[PDB]
Design a binder for this molecule. Structure first.
Ligand SMILES: CCN(Cc1cc(=O)n2nc(C)sc2n1)c1ccccc1
Ligand SMILES: N[C@@H](CCC(=O)O)C(=O)O
Ligand SMILES: [Ca+2]
Lengths: 277, 282
């Protein structure tokens, strides 16, 4: 029973999805399926054969080899990372919770509320909340009065996040006024947020630290930066989510700490995460 | 009748400060610059640090980042405790006797002398094979402490990779740093030099860098950077290698294990851990 159903989600450079070759998956890519609906009047769909690569995919490749398992990799279609809606989890967390996946592999933030319903492996990447601004924007960080009490300013500071993930949940729990203010600046995704910042439609973009630090590292003309020296609030990490009491957790944790010890994680960081800026 | 948790810790500034009690057995009332009272605990431990010598247990005062973390953990989970300092003064390694044994806080936890390790204890594969580690409370790495004026590039400096009796560099015996230099074959030539000069404690090694006796100390950046910020005559050189985290140590069958990690996650998410970092480390 070592052929495992594994859920993932696209988020460059952690997980990168490509169309199949002219007619299987080649190079450093692995096969990954995505259930695609026929129309919106039906539940009928078809799994499209795609190809996955990235930092988290190389981790899956190493774990599969060390921990000795094979897997069926799929991309989540019901939500994204994981949100608890009326006590029902969607996204990658939901897939693990409702046992459609043995594990979730991706840019998945370890937090307390997710940890109540899934077990997480040791963190493989450090993350948290970083703030991206145009170089020179004067903000101390999350605690800045520009974020805490935005209407104390004329015109007020414009900032938002991509909702439904661990960044929004944390801002909701810690800064109630800031949160209710931000919702009008909610971004559909990271790409829109970066464009909004560059087109002067947003002053700050609050998001996952590991993704923001990678985006700042690759920005054209190194214009967009993360405040502080790439500072991280509510520091956490990305971990593999497994079902509570999973028999795989012990071997996955030991393998990950083995990889860190052997400088293999530092190598993957060099190959996927380091930028020009 | 006690159901009190036996907590094992080690002397390691700024995570754990160890000071004598007053003539009456209480702790000197102290305050932060804010005017906030420094929380202190009675920690029993040996007054004779000397190796292969009798250990006379005396009540001492303990405080710091790790003690503040213990108090918060005990408050959240509703447990009682008693703290003692590791009898042999070590973090913990597995050494061959045919059989293999864990020493330090590791040995104490496995033998039942402790129910929980609350200290700057490095999470690694070797220890994770025998104990449960919580989610990390601190992420840091290894750096090098030298006297102000000693010019070194870092872990790839010719004075380290090509060892000689002229330049003496070391670490702490029976520590995770020792485990790291032993495991990695690419660092065997460095380990071979270090095994000859490794100290019993971080304090002794830091003091030997002050006394021109030890040229370079390889240790945890959270400790070394703190030491460099206080003792202006000492500086940390190079950037960070073997990035590693600190976690709480428990036995694999501990009933508190799930609730310890949730409390650590809660403390990172609500700014409490960053506040501890501000009070004690920065
Ligand atoms: C202390 C903050 N961290 C970040 C962290 C710690 C750590 O040991 N490692 N090991 C790696 C390899 S990446 C990494 N990131 C954290 C806190 C709670 C939950 C997860 C992470
Ligand atoms: N990695 C985050 C998603 C992005 C964010 O909300 O910052 C999570 O797992 O929820
Ligand atoms: Ca117990």
């Amino acid at each position: 029973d070592n052929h495992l159903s594994i859920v993932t989600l696209e988020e460059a450079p952690f997980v990168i999805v490509e169309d199949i070759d002219p007619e299987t998956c080649v190079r450093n890519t692995v096969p990954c399926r995505k259930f695609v609906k026929i129309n919106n009047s039906t539940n009928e769909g078809m799994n499209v054969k795609k190809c996955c690569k990235g930092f988290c995919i190389d981790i899956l490749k190493k774990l599969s080899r060390t921990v000795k398992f094979t897997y069926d990799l799929y991309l989540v279609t019901n939500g994204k990372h994981g949100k608890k809606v009326n006590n029902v989890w969607n996204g990658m967390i939901g897939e693990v919770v409702y046992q459609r996946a043995v594990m979730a592999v991706g840019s998945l933030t370890i937090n307390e509320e997710r940890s109540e319903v899934v077990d997480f492996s040791v963190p493989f990447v450090e993350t948290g909340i970083s703030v991206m601004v145009s170089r020179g924007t004067q903000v101390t960080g999350l605690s800045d009065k520009k974020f805490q009490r935005p209407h104390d300013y004329s015109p007020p500071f414009r900032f938002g996040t991509v909702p439904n993930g661990s960044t929004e949940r944390n801002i909701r729990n810690n800064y109630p006024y800031m949160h209710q203010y931000m919702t009008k600046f909610n971004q559909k995704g990271v790409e829109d947020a970066l464009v909004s910042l560059k087109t002067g439609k947003l002053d700050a973009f609050i998001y996952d630290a590991a993704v923001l630090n990678y985006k700042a590292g690759r920005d054209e003309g190194c214009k967009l930066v993360t405040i502080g020296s790439g500072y991280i609030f509510a520091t956490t990490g990305y971990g593999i989510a497994l079902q509570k009491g999973s028999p795989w957790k012990r071997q996955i944790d030991l393998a990950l700490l083995q990889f860190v010890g052997d400088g293999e994680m530092e190598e993957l960081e060099t190959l996927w995460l380091t930028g020009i800026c | 009748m006690s159901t009190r948790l036996k907590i094992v810790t080690i002397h390691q500034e700024p995570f754990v400060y160890v000071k004598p009690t007053l003539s009456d057995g209480t702790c000197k009332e102290e305050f932060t610059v804010n005017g906030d009272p420094v929380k202190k605990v009675i920690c029993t431990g040996p007054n004779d640090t000397s190796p292969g010598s009798p250990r006379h247990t005396v009540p001492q005062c303990c405080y710091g980042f790790c003690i503040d973390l213990l108090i918060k953990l005990a408050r959240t989970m509703n447990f009682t405790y008693e703290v003692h300092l590791v009898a042999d003064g070590k973090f913990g390694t597995q050494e061959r006797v045919n059989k293999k044994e864990w020493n330090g806080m590791m040995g104490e936890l496995l033998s039942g002398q402790a129910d929980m390790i609350v200290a700057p204890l490095t999470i690694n594969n070797e220890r994770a094979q025998y104990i449960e580690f919580s989610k990390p409370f601190k992420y840091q790495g290894l750096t090098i402490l030298v006297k102000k004026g000693t010019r070194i590039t870092g872990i790839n400096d010719p004075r380290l990779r090509n060892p000689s009796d002229k330049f003496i560099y070391a670490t702490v015996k029976q520590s995770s740093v020792d485990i790291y230099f032993r495991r990695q074959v690419e660092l065997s030539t460095m380990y071979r030099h270090m095994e000859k000069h490794n100290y019993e404690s971080a304090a002794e090694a830091i003091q030997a860098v002050r006394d021109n006796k030890l040229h370079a100390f390889i240790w945890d950046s959270a400790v070394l950077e703190f030491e460099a910020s206080q003792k202006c005559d000492l500086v940390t050189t190079g950037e960070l290698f073997f990035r590693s985290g600190f976690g709480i140590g428990m036995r694999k069958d501990s009933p508190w294990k799930q609730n310890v990690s949730l409390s650590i996650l809660k403390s990172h998410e609500n700014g409490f851990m960053e506040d501890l970092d501000k009070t004690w480390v920065r």
